[PDB]
């Protein structure tokens, strides 16, 4: 399959192809496959996949907002079990940020 799930791998991919790598599925899609977050069974129902592609509402307003710009997020460094605290954030106009502390702080990387 060749899973791409690193900050720079996904970031590069996001900027070069304007979409996430094939190893990503939204929370809703994971669910339809039998994902029960509290079970930490994502790898069991969708091997090689990670949660990604869902709209990021930037609720603390930490990321730069702008008219017409929408943010999305995707899990980074996930392989199996329960979800970690790493996320990649990308906007419609391709600004890329990351967080490794569950959205407390962000670092711009592109």
């Amino acid at each position: 399959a060749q899973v791409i799930n690193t900050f720079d791998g996904v970031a590069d991919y996001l900027q070069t192809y304007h979409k996430l790598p094939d190893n990503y599925i939204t929370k809703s899609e994971a669910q339809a496959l039998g994902w029960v977050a509290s079970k930490g069974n994502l790898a069991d129902v969708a091997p090689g996949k990670s949660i990604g592609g869902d709209i990021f509402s930037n609720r603390e307003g930490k990321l730069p907002g702008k008219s017409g710009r929408t943010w999305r997020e995707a899990d980074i460094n996930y392989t199996s079990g329960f979800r970690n605290s790493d996320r990649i954030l990308y906007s419609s106009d391709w600004l890329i940020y990351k967080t490794t502390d569950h959205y407390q702080t962000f670092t711009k990387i592109r």
Partner: protein, 89 residues
């Protein structure tokens, strides 16, 4: 899963997030912010979930609009489809 918040005991927005951390069995890395809460309510917490928020008004005081912003994430999660029942008493 059941979660209880005694509003009259919430003295800060910090108190609120730590109470939620415990009551919802959130990950140890819980970001203690609105984005981390949404992420926990939609990709971590167990369902069905019942949030009983007692003395909501009193907690609304010692946290500013914080209590309201936290409540909105729960309602937003419910709207997203999460099976969450909110009791504001």
């Amino acid at each position: 899963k059941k979660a209880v918040i005694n509003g009259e005991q919430i003295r800060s927005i910090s108190d609120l997030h730590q109470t939620l951390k415990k009551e919802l069995a959130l990950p140890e890395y819980y970001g203690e912010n609105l984005d981390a809460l949404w992420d926990a309510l939609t990709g971590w917490v167990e369902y069905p979930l019942v949030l009983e928020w007692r003395q909501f008004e009193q907690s609304k005081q010692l946290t500013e609009n914080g209590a309201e912003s936290v409540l909105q994430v729960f309602r937003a999660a419910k709207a997203e489809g999460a099976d969450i029942t909110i009791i504001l008493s």
